[PDB]
Every structure is written in structure tokens, then in C-alpha cells.
Amino acid sequence: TSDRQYSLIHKELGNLPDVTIHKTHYLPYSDTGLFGSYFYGNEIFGNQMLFLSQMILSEYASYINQAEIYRARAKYFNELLAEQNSADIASSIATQVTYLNRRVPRSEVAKRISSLDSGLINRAATRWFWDKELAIVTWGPSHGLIAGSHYNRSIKRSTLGWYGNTHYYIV
Amino acid sequence: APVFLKALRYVIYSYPLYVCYLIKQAQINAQG
Amino acid sequence: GVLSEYNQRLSKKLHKGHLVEDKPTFFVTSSRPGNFGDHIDFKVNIDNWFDENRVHNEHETDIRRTQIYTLNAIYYGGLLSFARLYAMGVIGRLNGWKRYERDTYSEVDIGALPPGEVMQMVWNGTPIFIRRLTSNEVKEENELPSNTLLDKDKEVILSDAGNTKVIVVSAVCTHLGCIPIPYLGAYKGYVCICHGSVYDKFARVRQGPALLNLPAINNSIHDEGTLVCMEQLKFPHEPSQRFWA
Amino acid sequence: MYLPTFYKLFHETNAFRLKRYVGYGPLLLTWSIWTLYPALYNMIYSDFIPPERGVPKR
Amino acid sequence: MEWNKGTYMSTSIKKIVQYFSVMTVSFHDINSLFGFFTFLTIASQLVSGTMLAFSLVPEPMLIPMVREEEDVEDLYTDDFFWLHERGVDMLFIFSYFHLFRKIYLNNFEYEQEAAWKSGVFTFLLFQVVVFLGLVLCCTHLSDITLAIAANLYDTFFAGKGKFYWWIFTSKELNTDTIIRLAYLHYVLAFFLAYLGLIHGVDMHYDWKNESSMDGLETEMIWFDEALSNELGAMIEIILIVMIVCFFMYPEPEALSYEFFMWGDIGFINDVRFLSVAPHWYFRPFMAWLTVCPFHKIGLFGLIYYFFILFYQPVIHGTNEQNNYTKRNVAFVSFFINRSDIMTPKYHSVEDNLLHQITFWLFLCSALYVTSYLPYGRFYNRINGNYGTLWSFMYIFFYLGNSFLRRPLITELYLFNAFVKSKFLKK
Amino acid sequence: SVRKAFYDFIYKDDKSAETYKVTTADPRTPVQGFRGQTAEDVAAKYEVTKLANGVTIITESQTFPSQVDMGILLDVTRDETNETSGSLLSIKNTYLKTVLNTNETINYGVVQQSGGSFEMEYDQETAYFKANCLAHDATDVFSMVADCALEPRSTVAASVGVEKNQNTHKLESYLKTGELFNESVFKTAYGLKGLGLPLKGLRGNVKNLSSYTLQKFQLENITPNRIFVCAAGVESHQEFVDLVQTKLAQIPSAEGQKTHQREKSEYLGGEVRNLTEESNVTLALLFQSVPWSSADIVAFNVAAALLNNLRLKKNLLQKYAYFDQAEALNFHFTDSGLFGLRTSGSADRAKDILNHSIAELKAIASGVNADELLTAKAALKNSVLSALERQTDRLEETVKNVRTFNKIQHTDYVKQIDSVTADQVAKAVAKVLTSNPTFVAQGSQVNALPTYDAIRNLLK
Ligand SMILES: CCCCCCCCCCCCCCCCCC(=O)OC[C@H](COP(=O)([O-])OCC(O)COP(=O)([O-])OC[C@@H](COC(=O)CCCCCCCCCCCCCCCCC)OC(=O)CCCCCCCCCCCCCCCCC)OC(=O)CCCCCCCCCCCCCCCCC
Ligand SMILES: CCCCCCCCCCCCCCCCCC(=O)OC[C@H](COP(=O)([O-])OCC(O)COP(=O)([O-])OC[C@@H](COC(=O)CCCCCCCCCCCCCCCCC)OC(=O)CCCCCCCCCCCCCCCCC)OC(=O)CCCCCCCCCCCCCCCCC
């Protein structure tokens, strides 16, 4: 069962048979950045993929379990240790030098991200995710999404954890 | 095995006897 | 201010009161899917409100979000105030209202009562005991064992007039309401006979199944025992004002 | 590795949700105090603060 | 019951909550919100009537004294009684405005059937409850209303074998009659809520604020975006009603219609039959009875009005044949040389002018019918108001006859213009 | 502490907290007080040992502190009979399901929380359960890798596997993936036996994949003499040897009992011509190549690198538009091999798709230019070394090298590629062409193609 795991987003996605792909993108730039989720799945679950990633992040603004923190920490450690191909490591070094004028060592990143705690995570989430604005795009069959296809009350209240999750759980 | 669950079981068994003890004492007092 | 904004909005060029485009306008998303092609000649849009309806505050958008939330809060607060008035009406209908307290003032003369006597009077349609205690009787009552007493909260109120303290208590048994024995040789107090409840000369509960003392009667003594004002204790009841003016 | 039992995860999640919902207890208390204030006044000065005994001479 | 295929919606708490949390409402105006006002007035009527029931003892000889004494000793009771009366008034106003609005938009199409009839039935039930409520006042107005209702009930049975006794015991208000009618009033008033919920679920299938088909696909989320507007429009209409009542009704007045409610059953035996008048909402029916002195014809008129009001979609609808139904025409057959006529198609609302003229004639006739009491003391000895007769007959003709609705003239003229233009341009 | 509890009850940052300073330190400069150690890479040492039973252990020594990789390779689809065809697919679809020591949910949670990964991949004549994780989580992870790789299938596992195999078959049929086409190719090449069994298994036998059949398959095939355990990034060989011994020592030696053995595979020159009414026609022409033992395998790889990178694109895809896609297939097996082309193009010109394709292959037999050979060798070196640079793939190929050649040869792949010459490639391809062709065609007009004898004559 999807519940018997330490990932809330995967718990939600397991119950959706037709939602096939999900990936989280963090794109930082010199002045701004974009952090979000891309879903690819059947249009019958359009209102779920639309309102899913918004909810989970907003939930972290109030409460995040230690299991999720440690899962993310271990995943980050493995990702840091797994960059072994010359091309990818060279590209990352060049990008880091370009945007920071410095090569960030593995140890420093590990120290920085390990220090994160439940309280720090909640505070960062409320700084960046709680009750914040959104950029939404829906490409494909919009027969069921055409109604409410504007920035109505549901869209603005979707960035509140457990508040405005009404539309996700229906269907 | 947990302390509080074991205590809960003990009080469940004992509380009826405690109420019986209180009833007996009330009878003794009412006797005079 | 408001006048400045009205002046600014006065000189606006619009078609019969509507701010609409005077020429056809076509907008194409540069990053549309490759299969969409060119925009068709159909004029989907008559208004450019997507751009005109803009306060260019992309910086500090949260301030406008908070302002919208505040306006919503004011509207909801008005609606909730009306709903609260309705709820007050409903609950006040269910919970009665004591508009005024009916008169219960009375006077009974106790001076005629010989010392060390108990008399029954009819007050508020209920029996009441009026008794006079001598100094020797009071002293005998004091120093007695406190084990028999079964009321730590209850107390005793003794009047001071007529050279002998006068006591007025409710003549109703706490057990079930039967009339207790007026006088007993062992203790010239009260001892119910229907079930054997035993009280003392102060009406306290001594060695008796009844768990409460005889209720006290609110009274104030004046004219040296000739004028015993007796009015039922008054409890608050609100709202008390029946007319605004 | 951190492998907590799902019992504990459920308990902690429900504890957080209970904490969140308890915050509205004061809200409803204030709503029911502003409303029905005469009832609260009668309760306070009839049970917790009983009236004085004596009666006026008149 | 194989004939019954099923229900449009299963009114379960889970599904109702989901449906109302996912509901979407298209942009609208105040004219298309009378239904919400009616429902909200129904809810307030339920609450206020529940509050009143705990005060009203169903014995006729105690209701007046109980009402008078419990207004003083208990706070908010008279407030709830006033709220109940004004809620009945506003409920009638909103219901009739809703009926007129839905008649205006030509909602007699087949797709509106489930929406239409479910509503009318509710309206019909809403009538009965009101009647029962009147009886609970135990005034001379209640006495007259009960007597008229009992006579109408006994009309069907030709005055044989006291078939009315199970409700209108002796045709008089007594302990048994009052108790039975009060309990039935409460139960049917609460049943009205479920009927309204069913009607509201049904009508959303094809809901339109205007006849013209706007191409908008985006819609408002009901819970707050539409609900806030509905509440605000209710507030605006209530303000307007307050202003109109404040100015039209001076604080002290002479010769009001409430003066017939002075007499209390039991206390006063003699009845001042010179001034007999019901509330304005039942005024049109008493006026019809006075205008039509024949008992059977008056009862038939009432029944016909209500039932033809129920069966609008069938007489005036497409009928599933896609306008290939053939009417029966008295005189147009000679002009066209055809026994029957195909139903006309182009019967838009905003554009055509005949529809608006006929609809507003009907609405003004209804208003005139409710405008006053015919005063039957000499309304027939004196040649009666011709306006009342004209309005009643136009009400009967408009509801039922399809020559005043979906007229053939528009279709024939449009086809003539089409033929001429096509011939000129080939 | 109390202060942290207070600052978490109200969601307000604690400025003085050291963790807050570390997390909010500016990315441009290092966090104050922390400065990690520096170390240099070291040459990799490979060590191989054998237990008292037949299990083998292979370790690649640490080259630089990184996540430890572990794996188990079983020589056990060629070892599937019609009774138990598709068992390996069911094992793959439920590789995390164990019930003896740890549960499916619990071992999945181990994978998730360790932060690493655990995968199962099977080919013909080989299955491989690989995993990568942090050192301090290695032990537990290995307990999962061994059990999942050695525990007999349970009834619940087989029940889930049947459903998952049915779903996989439906998906493969719906997508018309090249895997199904290769399954048909192998069926016609070897004849529904040995290497001829479909990789995903027969669809008619899916319902028969009960726990009993899977257990029979495992008992017949999984034996200690055919089990290789591998580690990469381990500081000490003996530590991992002890870690393995604590788990796989229980397995009894299979010596003294009649082994299943693998029947020598025979090559059949069949042909298949399926009418599918597809707007595109897919053809595949293959011949018998050399096994792993022969030294020509590298040459064959170069030949593939001569087609999939340089020739097949220019000669077919660029010049002709109806060629949807062409590629060169090169499979090696312990006792046989396959080499040839698979093309796909417009049905209406199916014949034109065939002839030209053959010519391209025949061109290789004619000869190879020096520049083309150098380009192909450079591309092959780039691909192979890109694969080897990643530790997991390097470990997998190390296991396969040990199990095939009994030594480690991936350390001198570059020298082998350099040693190849154009003459060797030309001679190898010419020799391969003489073998009986295996021809498969699926399309709308495959009914009109040159006869098998004509195909051979053109190839001649
Ligand atoms: C104790 C409380 C403390 C807290 C603060 C209290 C005060 C708060 C005041 C807030 C503002 C109230 C009035 C504006 C409401 C709208 C707000 C808004 O949208 O602003 C944001 C925004 C302005 O942006 P902003 O600059 O950031 O905001 C500035 C603030 O709003 C501020 O703007 P402003 O400062 O410029 O406001 C000036 C205004 C407010 O200043 C005050 O607050 C002072 C008020 C004093 C009232 C005293 C009354 C008597 C009682 C006291 C007596 C004793 C003292 C006597 C002293 C004598 C000394 C000699 O003073 C006036 O009275 C002058 C207004 C112009 C004269 C209009 C005369 C009435 C015309 C009505 C026509 C209605 C027609 C309807 C039907 C049409 C169809 C037939 O508004 C717009 O952009 C709207 C523009 C488009 C609409 C224009 C419509 C114009 C015509 C209608 C006007 C309706 C209002 C009339 C008010 C009259 C006085 C009550
Ligand atoms: C002997 C003692 C016995 C016990 C006695 C005590 C009984 C306690 C009952 C407790 C009931 C719990 C109900 C839970 C849900 C409540 C709403 C919620 O989620 O709150 C979060 C919410 C968080 O705040 P927020 O972020 O601003 O969100 C506001 C929105 O509500 C946030 O909403 P949204 O926009 O996110 O979406 C709203 C809605 C989307 O919109 C909808 O779909 C609305 C619903 C549509 C269908 C129904 C239509 C009618 C509307 C509902 C009825 C309203 C009138 C009720 C009148 C009752 C009688 C007077 O979506 C949903 O939430 C879907 C579910 C809706 C609730 C129904 C399902 C759960 C509860 C019931 C489950 C069991 C079945 C029922 C039967 C059980 C029988 C045992 O909390 C509040 O805002 C609470 C404010 C409270 C203070 C203001 C009002 C005070 C009253 C003023 C008048 C004067 C009296 C003063 C008070 C005196 C002391 C009481």
C-alpha cells in the first residue's frame, strides 16, 4: 500500500493509477528562481496533479516528519557521492564557479544540508511556500479543467496546508 | 509490557474492587 | 486623494463608457506547441483588460494579497455579526429570561418566643424553624466532637438582639424533605424520625445519613428582634435593562 | 537508517493535527463569551461569587 | 418498479458535501438569484418556526393568551414571530419573482422539465404549509380560512358522508383540528427543505442567468465566490424592502387589513363579515372566488391555475419531436389551408418583442389581481371591476394556450423574409 | 531543548542558533568553522576468492571515499523450460518481496531510507541484483540483497508476479516495442529453446508461474557454483568476505549431485514473415557471430560501432527518407552469438528497405576505410569508458568478466580496441555472412519479398 512508506508525495501518487510521471525542478538563476513540480498523467486526474504539489509543500510549512527529513538527507548524501562521470562533474564545477565564483566541496554541502531540522524546514517553507503565489500551466485536454481555469479562490487557497485541499481529494 | 498499558490493565481489574470497598465502607458508616 | 483619482479617471477615452480596444489585437505565445501554427483571423478579444487591469506591483504582491484578505475579512465580519445576533436570539429564546424578581420581603416578630424554643412559620409557602439559643446552650454545643459533623463548607449564622441570639433556618430535611423532630432530650436540636437523620442544635449534620445541613434563611434583625427582615437571596439575572430609554 | 514504525508516524501526525485544531478552542470560547455574555455574568456571580447574605432594613 | 429508471442524484451526506464543494456557478445577475433568496427564507422560516413551536400550546382557547404573555416574560419570542411573518411574506415575494423570471426565459423546454416540475411541486407544497400556518393563529381570519378550505374539500364529495372529518373536524378550529394541523404544518415545513434541495440539485443541470447563450466556459466556485454574492444580493433586496415598507406603511395607520384579525376564536362569537380579507398572498384566490360566484367553477379555476402552472413544459415544450409536433388551431387553418400547424421554432427571449409584450401583460394582470379585494358585498350588484375579469382571463389564457407563447406569426414572417432575400440573391 | 521547543511552537527563526547560522550562511563563502579533509585518488585493486562451497567473491578496492556498491550475479532465461518460462520476469517484477527474514515493506523502506538504490536486471544466461548505498548502511542493505537474490519465491510473491507479468505483456503489446520483435527474432533463430525462449517469457505460461514452478526453477538453476558476489569501494577485501560469509555460508555445496547443465545451443536458419497491416515495415537479418571465448568479439563490437555511429546513419537514414530507423544488433553468448541489422521503414517500399540494408552490411565485408575505422574505434572507446567511469556499471562488468573469462579484462579494453584492424573486421563480417541467414519481417506488404534462397544469393 502507498501509505506504508516514508514519502508523502509518493503516498499520494501511488493511489492515482493514471498519473504516470512527476518530477520536482529547482531552477536557480542570478536574480530569481523557480521551484515547482511537473506532472504528466491522465486528464481525469487533472484536478489532482493541479492541486497535489501545492498541498504537500504547504503542509511542510506547518509539520514535516523526521522520516522525510532523514530520507531527503540520505538521498542528498548519495547524490553527492554519486557524481562520478567526468562530463557531469565538469559541468557542475563550471556552473558553480560561474554563479558563485567558487567550487562548493562535497563536505561543505553535506554540512550545510545536514544541519537542517524540522523547525528550520518549517520556517523556510513558510518563507517560500506557505500562502504564496503560483505559476500554473496545463497543456492538454482541458474539458474538465476549463471551468475554474482562472486564478480563482481555489488556486490561491491551494498553497495552504490542509486549507483549500478540498479540490484535491475529490476524484 | 509497556508500563502504562500494564498499569491500565491493573486499574481495569482493580477499580471494580475499589468501588466494592467504598460501598462496604459506606454501609459500615450508615450502620452507625 | 479621492478627488485626484476622480479627476484622473475623468479624462479617459473609451467607447460608450467601456474601456475596449479600438483596433483588432492579436497576441501569440512564442513558446506554444509546434503544432499550433499561426493565429487565425478570428478576433477572439475585444478588450485588453488582461493588461489594462493591472497595478504594476509584481514587487510586493503579498501586500495586495493581504489587502484583499483584509477586505474579505471585513465582509465576513459583518456577515458574522448578523449571524451572531441571530444566534443570540435563538439561544435567548431557549434560555428563559427573568425580567424582574418577584417580591419576597417579609417580617416576623421573634421577641415573644421564649428562649430555648423552636417555632414553625410559613414563609414562601414553606415551613421555617425559628429558635432562640441561650449562652449555656451555645457553650454546650461548642467543644463537641467534630467527627460527627459532616459539612466542612457549611457554617452557622447567629443573630445578636434581644439579649439572646436568634436563629432562623429552613425547616426541611435535606434527605427527602420530611419535617424533623423539633426537640429531643439528649440534644434539644433536630433529629429526623422518618429515617433517623440526626442534626445538632445549630442544624449541623451530626451522625446522620443526611449529607447536608438544613438550608439557611436569609434574614437581617432590626428593632432588637421585633423586625426580622426576611427576603430571599437575590441572584444576578442579565440582561436587566428592559427599555433602552 | 531511520525506519520508524507507521504507528509512530500516525501518532505524530495526529498529535500535530490536534495541536492545530486546539488553536480554535480559544476562538470558539471568545465567540461564545461575546455571545451569551449575560449568561456568563449570571454564572460567575451566582456560583463562583455568591451574593452577600444580609438584607436591607426597609 | 421497473418503470422508474433511477434518481438524478443520490442525496447522501458524502456525495452532497462533495457536490457542493466542487460546484461551479456561471457569472450571473441579481434577477437569477431569487431561488437562493427563497431557500434562505425557507431556512430562517424553519428556525423561527421551531422557536415558535416551543411557545404555542395547540389548545385554541390558550393560543392568544399564551402568545400575549410569552412575548413579555420571554425575550425574543415576539421577534421570532415577526421574523416568521415577514419571512412568509418575503418567501412569497421571492417565489413569485422566481416564477416570473423562469416564465420569462421560456424554460418550458424538455431539458428543463426535471428542473421545472420539481420546482413547481415545491411551490405547490409551499402553498399548503402556508395555509396550515394561518390556522394556527386562531383568529377570525383563521376561522374563515378553515371554513373555506373545508368547503372546498367537501366540494369534491358533493357534501356526502363527512369525508373531511379526519382533518377539518366539524369544519371548525378546536383542540383536535388545531393539534393535527399544527403537527402537519411542522412536518410539511421540514419536508419543504428536502424538496427544495432536490429541486436545487435538479435545476443545476442546465442553469442560465439569461436566455442568450454566453460562450464563457469559466465559472465561479460556489462555496464563497457565488455564496457571498448571493448573500449580498439578499442584503440589498432586504434593504430595499425595508425602505419601501417604512415609507409605504406609516407607524399608525387607518383601515389596515390586519383589522380582521382582531376577533379571536372562542372569545368573540360574532364575526364582522363586512370586512373579510386574507393576507395579500392569498388575496388573489379570495378575489377569484368573489368574482366567480359559482362554487364549482371557482374551485376548478384554482385547480386549473395550479396544475397548468405545473404542466408548462408539456404544453409549451419541444415534446422530444424537435418542433415537428402539430398544434390544433381554430382560425389559422382557414388562412393557411391546413388542418394543423407545425410548432414555430424561433421564439427567443431578448430579441423578439411579442414575447415581452405578452409576458409583461401577464405579469401586470397578476399584480392587478393581487392589487385589491373585490369586496363581494355588492361587487356583483355593482357591475364589477372589468380590469379584474380581464386580468383573470388573461392569466388563464397565457398559462395553457400556445398562441400567446411561441406564436406562429414570428416564424411565418421570418420565413417570408428568408424567401424574399433568397429569391433576390438566388 | 526548551528554547528549540519554544521557537518551534511559534514558527520564528532563532537567530542565535548555530544551526540557523550554518543553514543561512551565504553560498559565496564557506561556513565558518568547517573545512573538510582533502584526499587523492588511489589505483584500484581487484581481488577474487572462493568459499568452501562454490560461491565466488570479487572486490574492487576503494579509489576515493564514495558510496559502496554491492551486487550478486547468478548465471541462471536460457535456463527456462516451457514449464517455467517467464519465471525470471516474475522475479524481476517482485524482486523486493521477501518473507523469511525481512518483509517487502520493510526492505523497501530500507532502500528508501538508506538513500541509495537497489535494482534487478536479467538477460539471457545471467541475472544481476545490484545495490549502492552509504558504507554505514551497507550491512543491512546486503542482508536485503542476498535474501532477495537467494530466497525461494513465496506464494504471495508469485501471486503478485503473475499480475505484474500480465500487465507487462499488455504494455509490450500495446507499445509494439522492439523487445517483442527481438523475442520473435530469437524464437526463429534458436527455436523456442535455450536462447530462443522469450526474454519476457511465454504469454501462455504466465498463469503457470506459481510459487511451485518458481521454486523448481530456483532449485534446478541456483547453485553455489554459479553465484558471484561483488563489492566496489570497500577498503578491505576481508571485511566484505566476512560480510558475505555471514550470509551465504549456509548454502550447501552442490558437488556430488547431478547438475542441471546447459545444453549446447544450435543455430537454425529460419524465417518469419508476419502480415500485421502496419503502415511501417520492420525487417531484421541476422547471422551467427562468435561466442565470448573467441577474440573476434571486440572486432564485432567495432563493426557495430562502424554502423550505429558512422555508416548506417549516412548511407541509409540521410540519403533515403522512407528509412524510419536502422540499427545494428550484436549479441554475445557463452556458446553462440548473433550479429546483423534491424531496419524499419515505409511499407510500400519494403523491398527497397531490404536490398539496400543488405548492401550496407555487405559493404563491411568489402572493406573498411582507415578514417572510418579510426572514427568507429574512437566512438567505441568513448562509450565504453563512459560506462566504466561510473562505479556501478564498472562493478557489473567486473562481475561479468570474472564469471565469463575467469579474470578481469575491462582494465585493458582500450588496448584491445586499438589492436583491432580493418582487415580483421572485414574478414570476420565476411565469415559471418556465409552462415545461414535468420530473416524476420513484420509489415503490411511483407508477403512480397525476395525468397529465402534469393536472400542468400544476394548475401553471397
Ligand atoms: C476616527 C476615524 C479615523 C480613521 C480615518 C477616518 C477617515 C477615513 C476616510 C476615508 C475616505 C472616505 C471617502 C472616500 C471613500 C472611498 C475610499 C477609496 O476608495 O479611496 C482609495 C482610493 C484613493 O487612493 P488613496 O489616495 O490611496 O486613498 C486616500 C484615502 O482614500 C483618503 O482620501 P481623502 O483623504 O482624499 O478623502 C477625502 C474625503 C474623506 O475625508 C474624510 O475622511 C473627512 C470626512 C469628513 C465628514 C464630516 C461630515 C460631518 C460630520 C462632522 C461635523 C463636525 C466637524 C465640522 C468641521 C468644520 C470645519 C470648518 O473628504 C471629503 O469629504 C471630500 C470628498 C469629495 C466631496 C464629495 C461630496 C459627496 C458626494 C457624494 C455623491 C454620491 C453620489 C451617488 C449616486 C450617483 C448616481 C446618481 O480611491 C480611489 O481611487 C477611488 C476613485 C474612483 C471613485 C471616485 C468617486 C468620487 C465621488 C464619490 C465619493 C464618495 C465618498 C464621499 C465621502 C464624503 C465624506 C464622508
Ligand atoms: C452534547 C454535545 C455534543 C457535541 C456538541 C458540539 C458539536 C461540534 C461540531 C463540530 C463540527 C466540525 C466541523 C468541521 C468543519 C468546519 C470548517 C472547517 O474546516 O474549519 C476550518 C476553518 C479554518 O479557517 P479558514 O482557513 O478561514 O477556513 C474557513 C473555511 O471554513 C474553510 O473552508 P474551505 O473553504 O476550505 O472549504 C469548505 C468546504 C467547501 O464548501 C462546501 O462544500 C460547504 C458545505 C456544502 C454542503 C453543506 C451546505 C451548508 C453549509 C454548511 C452548514 C453551515 C451552517 C450550519 C448551521 C448549524 C446550526 C446552527 O469544504 C470542506 O471543508 C468540505 C467539508 C465541509 C464540512 C463537512 C464535513 C466535515 C464535518 C462533518 C462530518 C460528519 C457529517 C455531518 C453530520 C455529522 C453528525 C454527527 O475554521 C474556521 O474558520 C472556523 C471559524 C469559526 C468561528 C466563526 C463562526 C462562529 C459562529 C458565529 C455565530 C455565533 C455563534 C458563536 C459560536 C458559539 C460557540 C460555538
Ligand SMILES: CCCCCCCCCCCCCCCCCC(=O)OC[C@H](COP(=O)([O-])OCC[N+](C)(C)C)OC(=O)CCCCCCCCCCCCCCCCC
Ligand atoms: C440583510 C440583513 C438586514 C439588512 C442590513 C444588513 C445587515 C448585515 C450587515 C452587517 C451589520 C453588522 C452590524 C449590525 C448591528 C445591529 C445591532 C442591533 O441593532 O442589535 C442590537 C441588539 C442588542 O441588544 P442589547 O443586548 O443591547 O439589549 C437587548 C434588550 N433590549 C431589547 C431591552 C434592548 O441586538 C439584539 O439584541 C437583537 C437580537 C435579535 C434576535 C432575533 C432576530 C430579530 C431580527 C433582528 C433584525 C431586524 C432587522 C431586519 C432583519 C431582516 C433580515 C432577517
Ligand SMILES: CCCCCCCCCCCCCCCCCC(=O)OC[C@H](COP(=O)([O-])OCC[N+](C)(C)C)OC(=O)CCCCCCCCCCCCCCCCC
Ligand atoms: C444542535 C447543534 C447546535 C445548534 C445551535 C443552535 C442553538 C442551540 C442551543 C441549544 C443547545 C445548547 C447546548 C449547550 C447548553 C448550554 C447553553 C448555554 O449557553 O448555557 C445557557 C446557560 C443558562 O443561561 P441563564 O442562566 O442566563 O438562563 C437560565 C436561567 N434564567 C432563565 C433564569 C435566566 O448559561 C450558562 O450558564 C452558560 C455560561 C457559559 C457561556 C458559554 C457557553 C459555551 C458552550 C455553549 C455554546 C453554544 C453556542 C451555540 C451557537 C449556535 C449558533 C447557531
Ligand SMILES: CCCCCCCCCCCCCCCCCC(=O)OC[C@H](COP(=O)([O-])OCC[N+](C)(C)C)OC(=O)CCCCCCCCCCCCCCCCC
Ligand atoms: C462521553 C461523550 C459522549 C457524547 C459525544 C461527545 C462529542 C463531542 C464532540 C465535540 C468535541 C470534539 C473534540 C475533539 C475533536 C477532534 C477532531 C479531530 O479530527 O481530531 C484531530 C485528530 C485527527 O485529525 P484529522 O484531520 O485526521 O481529523 C479527521 C478525523 N477523523 C478521520 C476521525 C474524522 O485526532 C486526534 O489526534 C485528536 C482526536 C480527539 C478526539 C479523540 C476521541 C477519543 C479519545 C477521547 C475520548 C474518549 C472517551 C469517549 C467517551 C466514551 C465513554 C465511555
Ligand SMILES: CCCCCCCCCCCCCCCCCC(=O)OC[C@H](COP(=O)([O-])OCC[N+](C)(C)C)OC(=O)CCCCCCCCCCCCCCCCC
Ligand atoms: C483568564 C483568561 C486568560 C486569558 C489569557 C489570554 C492570553 C493570550 C496570549 C496569546 C499570545 C500569543 C500566542 C501565539 C501562539 C501561536 C502558536 C502557533 O504557532 O500556532 C500555530 C498552530 C497551528 O498552526 P497552523 O498549522 O494553523 O499554521 C501555522 C502557520 N505557518 C504554516 C505559517 C507556520 O496553532 C497552535 O499552536 C494552537 C495551539 C496553541 C494554543 C492553544 C490554547 C488553548 C487554550 C484553551 C482555552 C483555555 C481557557 C481557560 C480555561 C480555564 C478552565 C478552568
Ligand SMILES: CCCCCCCCCCCCCCCCCC(=O)OC[C@H](COP(=O)([O-])OCC[N+](C)(C)C)OC(=O)CCCCCCCCCCCCCCCCC
Ligand atoms: C383561479 C385564479 C387564482 C388566482 C391566480 C392568479 C395569479 C396570482 C399571481 C400572484 C402574483 C403575486 C406577485 C406579487 C409581487 C409583488 C409583491 C408586493 O409588492 O407585495 C404585495 C403588495 C402589497 O400589498 P399590501 O396589502 O401590503 O398593500 C397594498 C394595499 N392595498 C391593497 C390597499 C393597495 O400588493 C400590492 O398592492 C401590489 C400592487 C400595487 C400597485 C400600486 C401601483 C401604483 C398605482 C397608482 C395609481 C395611479 C395614481 C396616479 C394617477 C395619475 C397619473 C397616471
Ligand SMILES: COC1=C(OC)C(=O)C(C/C=C(\C)CC/C=C(\C)CC/C=C(/C)CC/C=C(\C)CC/C=C(/C)CC/C=C(\C)CC/C=C(\C)CCC=C(C)C)=C(C)C1=O
Ligand atoms: C393525517 O394525520 C396526520 C397528521 O396530522 C394531520 C400529522 O401531523 C402526521 C405527522 C406528525 C406527527 C406524527 C407529529 C410529529 C411532530 C413534530 C415533528 C413536531 C416537532 C418538530 C420539531 C422540529 C421539534 C424539535 C424539538 C426540539 C429541538 C427539542 C429539543 C429538546 C431536547 C431535549 C434536545 C436534547 C436532548 C436529546 C437530543 C436527547 C439525547 C439524550 C440526552 C440529552 C440524555 C439526558 C439524560 C441524561 C441522564 C444524560 C401524520 C403522520 C398524520 O397522519
Ligand code: HEM
Ligand atoms: C417554509 C416553512 C414555513 C412556512 C412557509 C410557514 C408558514 C406559516 C404561516 C403563513 C403562518 C401564519 C403567519 C400569520 O398568519 O401571520 C405560520 C405560523 C406558525 N408556524 Fe409556520 N411556516 C413554516 C415553518 C414552520 C415550522 C418548521 C414550524 C415549527 C417547527 C412552524 C410553526 C409555526 C407556528 C407555531 C405558527 C403560529 C405561531 C403563533 O400563532 O404565534 N412553522 N407559519
Ligand code: HEM
Ligand atoms: C420554494 C420554492 C422554490 C425554491 C426553494 C427554489 C429554489 C431554486 C434555486 C436555489 C435555484 C437556483 C438559483 C436560481 O436559478 O435563481 C432555482 C432555479 C430554478 N427554479 Fe426554483 N425554486 C422554487 C420555486 C420554483 C418554481 C415555482 C419554479 C417554476 C414554476 C422553479 C423552477 C426553476 C428552474 C427552471 C430553475 C433553473 C433555472 C435555469 O435553469 O436557468 N422553481 N430554484
Ligand code: FES
Ligand atoms: S426524611 Fe429526613 S432523613 Fe429520611
